[PDB]
Amino acid sequence: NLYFQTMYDFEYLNGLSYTELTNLIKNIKWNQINGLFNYSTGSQKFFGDKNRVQAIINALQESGRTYTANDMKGIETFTEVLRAGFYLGYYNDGLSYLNDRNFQDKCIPAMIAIQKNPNFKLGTAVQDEVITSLGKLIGNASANAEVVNNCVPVLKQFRENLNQYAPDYVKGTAVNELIKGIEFDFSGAAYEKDVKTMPWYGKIDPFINELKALGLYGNITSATEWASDVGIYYLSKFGLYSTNRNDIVQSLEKAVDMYKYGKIAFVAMERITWDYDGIGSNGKKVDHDKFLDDAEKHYLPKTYTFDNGTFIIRAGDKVSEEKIKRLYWASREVKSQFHRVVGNDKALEVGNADDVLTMKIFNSPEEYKFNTNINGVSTDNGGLYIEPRGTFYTYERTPQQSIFSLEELFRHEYTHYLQARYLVDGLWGQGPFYEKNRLTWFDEGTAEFFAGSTRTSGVLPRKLILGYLAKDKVDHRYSLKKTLNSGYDDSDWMFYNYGFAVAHYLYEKDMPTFIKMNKAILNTDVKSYDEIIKKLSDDANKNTEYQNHIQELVDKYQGAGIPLVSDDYLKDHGYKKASEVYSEISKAASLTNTSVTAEKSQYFNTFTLRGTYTGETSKGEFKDWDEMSKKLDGTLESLAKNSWSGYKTLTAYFTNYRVTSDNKVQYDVVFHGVLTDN
Ligand SMILES: [Zn+2]
DSSP states (O other), X not given: OOOOOOOBOHHHHTTSOHHHHHHHHHTSOGGGBTTTTSOOHHHHHHTTOHHHHHHXXXXXXXXXXXXXXXXXXXXXXXXXXXXXXXXXHHHOTTSGGGGOHHHHGGGHHHHHHHHHSTTOSSOSHHHHHHHXXXXXXXXXXXXXXXXXXXXXXXXXXXXXXXXXXXXXXHHHHHHHHHHHHHHHHHHHHHTTSOGGGSTTTTSOHHHHHHHHHHHTOOOOOTTTHHHHHHHHHHHHHHGGGSSOHHHHHHHHHHHHHHHTTSHHHHHHHHHHHHHSTTBOTTSSBOOHHHHHXXXXXXXXXXXXXXXTTTEEEEEOTTSOHHHHHHHHHHHHHHHHHHHHHHOOOSOSSSSOGGGSEEEEEESSHHHHTHHHHHHOOOOSSSEEEEGGGTEEEEEOOOTTTOSSOHHHHHHHHHHHHHHHHHTSOSSTTOSGGGTTTXXXXXXXXXXXXXXXXXXXXXXOOBHHHHHHHSSOOTTTSOOHHHHHHOOSSSOOTTHHHHHHHHHHHHHHHOHHHHHHHHHHHHTTOHHHHHHHHHHHHHOHHHHHHHHHHHHHXXXXXXXXXXXXXXXXXXXXXXXXXXXXXXXXXXXXXXXXXXXXXXXXXXXXXEEEEEEEEEEEEOOOHHHHHHHHHHHHHHHHHHHTTSSOGGGGGOEEEEEEEEEOTTOEEEEEEEEEEEEOOO
């Protein structure tokens, strides 16, 4: 169509002679051809002239024959043009002839020429790019056993310089693209056919052996591990085209043993399971689950059992016993504050997995990654609680690996365990309160909030979250409306920090609403919850209140702290007669109709004392809550003035607010602490 111009349209290229065209292609870059990968009338007529594409194929072959270490003879730009051809032909009827294997094979003479060149080696940028381009072309075109086995020298060269070459992006990419391209083509052709019917079947043993050597290199480092990963993955794939099935499975099994509980061993097992029907070289079925089970025992060998086996920590061998204890005692501080605010400590459902809380704490982030392999959950996080398993997965960490210590993070995630067991009825995230966007701010916001639980001072803000709140006031602070009604669509990284601010704002400045809101969720009453959220969002004064609270929180940053369990918990408390502890607590807290259970843990025993507290005439539910909190914290503080160090392990909460027939405040009250009497 066109006969005048440095970007080039198909209408112009279509008008050139094949010799003027091929020459032009040879000394431009692929991106200079407009709409190369787009299907048009112009690209239709460019490809679809079988003579012109065969002209391009021929030019490529001549480049393969003549390229040097410093000059690529336009092999990249040629390969991309052909790739565009086979790509458009796969997707667009009218260029259907390009999708035909018999036509794709017309590139093999070009490929063989490229490989016969003395410069077909890893080395300089040109030589590497040729190998890269070749692999990408094979993925869209074709290969046969001859071209595949001609890659064996490259794979040898790479292997022989693995520590120099495997880390290099360019050389690593070259080899990866070569293997990946060939496999894509072969699996494409072998798709849904008897694999013994393929030409290359049995003819690629030299290539397969090069993958073997790569996969079983053994002396891998963090930098080179992917290379041997590649080796094993593709050993399995290409080994489908070997006559000795058991020989391949045997090498995959050696990978498993050689690499045991590193990445490559998981890959090797996957290959045996998927590519070889999970049947070992000895012909017997491989115990995949035992391997996973062994992997977990390796990574999490230590078990620490608390509360008659209802709080179990499985941990890496380097996670501190001291830490383990601190986490137990943290759990109790958060639990208690949560029950105070919610007013229920009876599990909503009978028989759920969370009847036992299991925590799995890997030694490190590195080792944490294997938890996706082992337990099938994401490890792109600092931790995760899976409610239907009643299991929290996380890992020990230094300050460099995370801003959050293990205790801080657990304190947050433990609240999710509390929400599912004690607050939100039904299955986690799959009830009325999730049929619309309702609890997104709440679930995360209150978790950040309850993480700041203390023993005797209620819930306190956490310095790090206040740190986040020191960011652009300018336009950036969420309004109350935005925080309450914002979801996964409308939000950025500060969402949960403003959700915490709403939680805290309500806690400190509007407890009546916080209690109402919590009751609404507890009672499974979406109507009332929605009304509270609408009232809050519609009242501009409440937003002015809230905007101020945000500044107040920000002002508290300088002097703020990380609520963390005291060292007092870890001291040697010494003996005290049980009935004396129960009497002093019962008297001090004015409890009636008390009962106690004792529970055995790894390093100590505990007790849980339950009673009824009937006070003076009610001053209203919310003022009652305020005063009961000060009375109960006062009781905890005065008990810790006693000589027995064990009184410093106490946590307490109250539930089931009611008024009596004579208007007297009433609660169920619960204390928990260490027990040092047989
Ligand atoms: Zn969370």
